Design an enzyme around this catalytic site. Structure first.
Site, PDB file in Angstrom:
ATOM      1  N   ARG D  55       0.839  -1.209   0.000  1.00  0.00           N
ATOM      2  CA  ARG D  55       0.000   0.000   0.000  1.00  0.00           C
ATOM      3  C   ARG D  55       0.879   1.266   0.000  1.00  0.00           C
ATOM      4  O   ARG D  55       1.791   1.399   0.829  1.00  0.00           O
ATOM      5  CB  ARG D  55      -0.934  -0.040   1.212  1.00  0.00           C
ATOM      6  CG  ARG D  55      -1.644   1.272   1.532  1.00  0.00           C
ATOM      7  CD  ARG D  55      -2.349   1.191   2.876  1.00  0.00           C
ATOM      8  NE  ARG D  55      -2.972   2.441   3.300  1.00  0.00           N
ATOM      9  CZ  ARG D  55      -2.559   3.201   4.317  1.00  0.00           C
ATOM     10  NH1 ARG D  55      -1.547   2.821   5.089  1.00  0.00           N
ATOM     11  NH2 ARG D  55      -3.178   4.343   4.567  1.00  0.00           N
ATOM     12  N   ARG D 102      -5.904  19.739   8.213  1.00  0.00           N
ATOM     13  CA  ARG D 102      -4.595  19.587   8.879  1.00  0.00           C
ATOM     14  C   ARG D 102      -4.159  20.912   9.519  1.00  0.00           C
ATOM     15  O   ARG D 102      -4.608  21.988   9.129  1.00  0.00           O
ATOM     16  CB  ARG D 102      -3.536  19.067   7.901  1.00  0.00           C
ATOM     17  CG  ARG D 102      -3.607  17.567   7.644  1.00  0.00           C
ATOM     18  CD  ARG D 102      -2.340  16.981   7.049  1.00  0.00           C
ATOM     19  NE  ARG D 102      -2.454  15.538   6.850  1.00  0.00           N
ATOM     20  CZ  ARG D 102      -2.072  14.594   7.714  1.00  0.00           C
ATOM     21  NH1 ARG D 102      -1.423  14.910   8.822  1.00  0.00           N
ATOM     22  NH2 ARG D 102      -2.345  13.326   7.460  1.00  0.00           N
ATOM     23  N   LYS D 155     -13.361   3.092   2.303  1.00  0.00           N
ATOM     24  CA  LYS D 155     -12.970   3.276   3.701  1.00  0.00           C
ATOM     25  C   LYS D 155     -14.118   3.867   4.536  1.00  0.00           C
ATOM     26  O   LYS D 155     -14.548   4.985   4.312  1.00  0.00           O
ATOM     27  CB  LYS D 155     -11.770   4.213   3.779  1.00  0.00           C
ATOM     28  CG  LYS D 155     -10.423   3.523   3.685  1.00  0.00           C
ATOM     29  CD  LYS D 155      -9.282   4.447   3.365  1.00  0.00           C
ATOM     30  CE  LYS D 155      -8.545   4.955   4.583  1.00  0.00           C
ATOM     31  NZ  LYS D 155      -7.268   5.592   4.169  1.00  0.00           N
ATOM     32  N   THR D 213      -5.372  -0.753  11.084  1.00  0.00           N
ATOM     33  CA  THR D 213      -4.946   0.325  12.046  1.00  0.00           C
ATOM     34  C   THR D 213      -4.735  -0.181  13.486  1.00  0.00           C
ATOM     35  O   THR D 213      -5.646  -0.704  14.134  1.00  0.00           O
ATOM     36  CB  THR D 213      -5.824   1.582  11.938  1.00  0.00           C
ATOM     37  OG1 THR D 213      -5.632   2.145  10.640  1.00  0.00           O
ATOM     38  CG2 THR D 213      -5.505   2.614  13.000  1.00  0.00           C
TER      39      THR D 213
END
Ligand SMILES: O=P(O)(O)OC[C@H]1O[C@](O)(COP(=O)(O)O)[C@@H](O)[C@@H]1O
Ligand SMILES: O=P(O)(O)OC[C@H]1O[C@](O)(COP(=O)(O)O)[C@@H](O)[C@@H]1O
Ligand SMILES: O=P(O)(O)OC[C@H]1O[C@](O)(COP(=O)(O)O)[C@@H](O)[C@@H]1O
Ligand SMILES: O=P(O)(O)OC[C@H]1O[C@](O)(COP(=O)(O)O)[C@@H](O)[C@@H]1O
Ligand SMILES: CC(=O)Nc1cc(C(F)(F)F)no1
Ligand SMILES: CC(=O)Nc1cc(C(F)(F)F)no1
Ligand SMILES: CC(=O)Nc1cc(C(F)(F)F)no1
Ligand SMILES: CC(=O)Nc1cc(C(F)(F)F)no1
Lengths: 416, 416, 416, 416
Positions: D55, D102, D155, D213
């Site tokens: 990935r 962010r 996702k 995760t």
């Protein structure tokens, strides 16, 4: 005591012909009364053989002939009342003629018959040729206010009946599968399908279902049944019928007592072969969650009776309703229902497993004292009849105050 | 196509009298031949009505009378051989007298009878009054080397038989529940328990079980059966019997053809009410893990037939063994077994669901070409008989080389 | 209230993140006491956060340092005794050093430690490195007659322990899966297999099992756990652990209170996702038939609690034994056990679902009056804590006379 | 070989730490590539350790830095192409940035990234922050016609995603449970519920689900995982995840190879503890009846593989679709899929149990000859890798003519 098999196939493989059944017989026996069994002397013998209900067929005979049958059944019944421990209540049932060719729900002749049955104090009515829910409502209206406690059992006997079955069941108190007539209106190889569909739906609703017609037919002329007749009675009991019915065998035939004794022996044997583990699992999974205390107590009681292999469940009841709630979970043990209401004791014969006893004793002053008296009475009955002995375990159901609708307590007690 | 119900109770509640069965009839029909059905003309009618096996009863009659029965059955059978697509094989079965009072396994008279049946080329023997495994070994020894392919079906008819049942089943090719005699030696209300125990154990072992005696007994004198008789045949089929047997009804009675037609209609209807979801789940959980390719292929084939609702399973077989392995998982679909061996085709009537067809065509030079010919033959038979039509789906089982014991391939193919 | 799904796969698919859990938390919380949580002020906060048991680790420290820990735990605990409705009992547990390298069952140092714990009145002992049943018998002998009510929980931490597991379980009162040590002696990818085998066998025996070591390990340094740690606590609760244990997190770490609060929230959520329909079905099928009245009453009570969706099961208990019998059937509802014995109330933290309450009130003169007082006390506690409110339904278990061993009555009652 | 336990509780009690797993590992391993594992030398080691998918995370780095990662992965992969029997295909996956602080489904930066991935020939796209079915349709439109074979994995990472889950699953090729982000948007004690709901629904639909995760998070700094991390990977495999994903552990950490080797060992052990008897029973009961030949063949093949305990299922496939149909029934045996299409071989890593092999050999002139060649190739691969040995039994699936969509034949064959 070893556990039941894990699969249905394994259960079958383990059945044993060298394994005595228990003394109690859960399924009720209904006999037709006619020329061969009208006398007081013969009726006393039918009662000792195992008859619970006497059916009168209003296709033939005058009102005056029928009233003399009801008088002989009652005389025969009260002849045993001297000893309260061994007395058996016996119900009377009135079968209508219906819309018959030799059309409306209730004919003019049927009005007269229904109205006659309210005066003679019958316990139930078998209504012929029911096609829709509005036919049941018609019969309920003719009985009026005077006969509001008489139970209506609907006879299913044609194609329309089978198609509209679910609405007829919601309106009725019980159902009768009338195989004779039904086997002419639909093709005869389909009758077994209609029978199993109908027994299935009544078990799911917790309502009584009766299987009738041609069950021991060869015993009219010969004192023993054929191999097929022995297997037909056993299979009705294993499908889940509450009662089985004799017609010609007891009305007209040559061997009425032998026929009653044959039904008693077969039914007792079939009851010991039920696969209780799977049946109780399915009825639970299918039961509603509800805040009703009486329902929660009944399922608790049945569950405890399997765990300790009890010899009986004793229930005190006014209207019958507490005993009917235990009976829908199909316990292995007999249900001994103690009552003071004589009509409640006759009607309890329609539910599988209920063994009704009538308390004669006067009401005590202290209410908790009156309750202990009736529990002790039920212990003596079970001892005399051989359902259990000293040191065995019984379940006892009671309520917290007097009146209907307050059953909430379950105890596990040793037989004194 | 909707899925089957999740519980047994829910399955019962959903049965429907307005739902036509499939054309195929899985259970085999065995008829006794006697005065009322010995003629060539009547036998042709019994064959078209649905008879698969002809039983001869060696309690009465001389060898010379019996040899003239075998000749009429064979004449009747070959009268249909002109059209290979519609020809039905018919087996012949020899029932012994046994140790009877009007003692050893095989009497002096029974030696003569068994030895007579090897010369007349019968397919099976029904051995009366088997008590222990050493009785079966005695019968196998009298048939010798000449009759080593004749199947032995053991008749269970007393208390000792029932007690030693497991060792008798390991020695025999099949079992017959003989209710008439068994219902005198044990109490008649226990016969239904012995019947269900024995059907259960044979289903578990993958061996054939036959239910006999008094199934349609009233059809001797009247052209219609009683309500009890209709339910007794249906219940044997729902317990798991491979075949049902007529005695008096076809031998001596007044309505032989009507009795054969009644068994055909009932059996077809009962087969549509089997609860296949639970039955297949249990037989799998109970099956051994084994490195045998033929077993793995059969369970694959049955599993695929449920998923695509196929109209048939076609199996090529020399000895029969590949078809017997599919039949023990009790598929819903018919099993069409194609063979060149005429005796393999007569014996395949003892297993539930096998519809045997005899290929007459000469062997082709290329082996893969010979295989396609026999598959096409089986497609034409299923079309003519109405088991399926063009565009439907069938399962085809074959092997990788010629000879017995190499079945290993399963294909899913559209009907051409 | 809708029924539970019919399969395990369907149950999973129906879980919902928008569905609030019930107020009660069934699984117990065990905390190690050390430098970060020894003070009276911090211990008061741990008690309000949800700590039930305080573990002392006798690997380090003198007897005199440990005796000052026991005094602070008891001070913290009694600070809440002013209001009897909101008081929570807190147990103390002594963890031995064992045969350790930095050999016999009980070292010379362990004698001194065990003998010290009898004098300080602890509730349970966690015995390190048990290998065989004769090691448990050794520990039981050192506690003597004075400490015959102290429970022994055996720590399984090597290969020999796992191999001889069944005999260790029969000798012990409970089991601890010690993952830290066990994950060095066997390969670390096999630890999850040993954990599930051991939780399975204890659930089957109705004995307590504790899951220990590295459950929230990252919360030593950070105030939130990792995603893996959240799933590890939930999975121990869904396998069937009775209690979960914190070590470093509460002994040495920087965030002791946050760690206790995280375990409380996770455990409550996992308890609402148990598939109760299948779990209760399996524990019943596996339960012995026995003539013991107390066992029959407990299974009745659990069965009724599912049917009426009750808010609690109230049990009066001297020794604890009646509450332990209800807890092995894993009800959804909390079990409120009312007792007068303070040591019985501390030990009841080891069983899943038991919420113990200590009755302070003096014994009444009339025994039936004393019984009603304790039932009313348990109703007030459940109201204050928010387990139910007026008009809800509770199950109440009692006995027929005073003393241990006579629980036999189950009632369904509305909250007053 | 003994049968599996009859209940889930009995299955748990029988797990054994002294029982070696099979050589095959069914669950796929996805690794993030970053500074610690970008080199050709390290990537060769990750491939031999068990990495199936690489990935790339497009949150950071320029197009030019990413294109040099794709070149090193491909070099490392082709270094093994010299020996066709031992070559392993390795997929490349592109993870988008998404709407991040962010906001629309596909940002302006994401257009450039998606369009870059079509030019570099990637196998799959992991689309971040999917909220509704119209977001998936947006991504499918940007890939265009050129990238119509690239798989989209959605996702799920917020509350809206979980609520609208069923419509997102119908639009996507596969699902990723993104625990990191999801554990901030919903309360952290509810993450385990969202995970099990989502694995359940994908297993029911036969679509791939990936668990991501913080699975081995402590292995960034230390060479061994904590006890919690070992149990978190095992539990994802027992719930039913198709693949597990490493992030920080392989991208930035100090021990990338040890982390890949830990996931390989755990997953292999968890696969041997699945309760196959109940899982296969439920997926069958839930499968549609359909006239599709390929579906009927797949369920036949899986059913036969349990009965003969086969060492593998060999499937010839162009598009992959035949192998995906076998994989949804969750066989115990590995599925060896033989293909000539290199992109079909890289994408088959997303389904549990598929071991893909790439045939290099030229097409033979006779079509039946070409088919035998590819079956023999798959036998050699299984021998070299140790999945089985000479004399074992394998299942082989093929079709009746060339082209996609005609798989219809299942054979059981001994390993030559
Ligand atoms: O008619 P039902 O609903 O079966 O009611 C049974 C009732 O009988 C009792 O057990 C006893 O009542 P009685 O003393 O009035 O006969 C009640 O406590 C209970 O409510
Ligand atoms: O007698 P069985 O075991 O049923 O064997 C069936 C056999 O018939 C075949 O399918 C065809 O064989 P034949 O061509 O010899 O008749 C074999 O491939 C298989 O082994
Ligand atoms: O210790 P155990 O077995 O749980 O016993 C519970 C006992 O408590 C009671 O319910 C009440 O007894 P006490 O009044 O002596 O406390 C008894 O009737 C019953 O036998
Ligand atoms: O892509 P899919 O549907 O898996 O199709 C598999 C196909 O591969 C085959 O088995 C072999 O085909 P090819 O020779 O064209 O590769 C066909 O018979 C079958 O239809
Ligand atoms: C409807 C039904 O349950 N039939 C039945 C039960 C049995 C037995 F095996 F339980 F006896 N056989 O047939
Ligand atoms: C043995 C047995 O299976 N009996 C049976 C089946 C049914 C039916 F409901 F499936 F028809 N009734 O009785
Ligand atoms: C042992 C066990 O029961 N595990 C489990 C339960 C569930 C859930 F689906 F019920 F939550 N998931 O994993
Ligand atoms: C979801 C699930 O199936 N969990 C699980 C399985 C097992 C085991 F017992 F099968 F291993 N334990 O927990």
């Amino acid at each position: 005591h070893a556990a039941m098999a894990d699969t249905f196939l394994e259960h079958m493989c383990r059945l044993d012909i060298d394994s005595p059944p228990i003394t109690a017989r859960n399924t009720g026996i209904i006999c037709t009364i006619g020329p061969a069994s009208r006398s007081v002397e013969t009726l006393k013998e039918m009662i000792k053989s195992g008859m619970n209900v006497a059916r009168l067929n209003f296709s033939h005979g005058t009102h005056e002939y029928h009233a003399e049958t009801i008088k002989n059944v009652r005389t025969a019944t009260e002849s045993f009342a001297s000893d309260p421990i061994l007395y058996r209540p016996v119900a009377v049932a009135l079968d209508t003629k219906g819309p018959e060719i030799r059309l409306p729900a209730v004919s003019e002749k049927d009005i007269q018959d229904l109205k006659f049955g309210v005066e003679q104090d019958v316990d139930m009515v078998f209504a012929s040729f029911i096609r829709k829910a509005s036919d049941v409502h018609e019969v309920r209206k003719v009985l009026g206010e005077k006969g509001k406690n008489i139970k209506i059992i609907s006879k299913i006997e044609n194609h329309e009946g089978v198609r509209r079955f679910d609405e007829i069941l919601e309106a009725s108190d019980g159902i009768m599968v009338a195989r004779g007539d039904l086997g002419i209106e639909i093709p005869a190889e389909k009758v077994f399908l209609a029978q199993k569909m109908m027994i299935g739906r009544c078990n799911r609703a917790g309502k009584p279902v009766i299987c009738a017609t041609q069950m021991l037919e060869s015993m009219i002329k010969k004192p023993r049944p054929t191999r097929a007749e022995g297997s037909d009675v056993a299979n009705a009991v294993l499908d889940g019928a509450d009662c089985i019915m004799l017609s010609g065998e007891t009305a007209k035939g040559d061997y009425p007592l032998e026929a009653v004794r044959m039904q008693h022996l077969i039914a007792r044997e079939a009851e010991a072969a039920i696969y209780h583990l799977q049946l109780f699992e399915e009825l639970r999974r299918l039961a509603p969650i509800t805040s009703d205390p009486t329902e929660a107590t009944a399922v608790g009681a049945v569950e405890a009776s399997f765990k300790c292999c009890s010899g009986a469940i004793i229930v005190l009841t006014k209207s019958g309703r507490s005993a009917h709630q235990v009976a829908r979970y199909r316990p292995r043990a007999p249900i001994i229902a103690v009552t003071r209401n004589p009509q409640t004791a006759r009607q309890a014969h329609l539910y599988r497993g209920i063994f009704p006893v009538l308390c004669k004793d006067p009401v005590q002053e202290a209410w908790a004292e009156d309750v202990d008296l009736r529990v002790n009475f039920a212990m003596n009955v079970g001892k005399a009849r051989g359902f259990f002995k000293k040191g065995d375990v019984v379940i006892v159901l009671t309520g917290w105050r007097p009146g209907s609708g307050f059953t909430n307590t379950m105890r596990v007690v040793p037989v004194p």
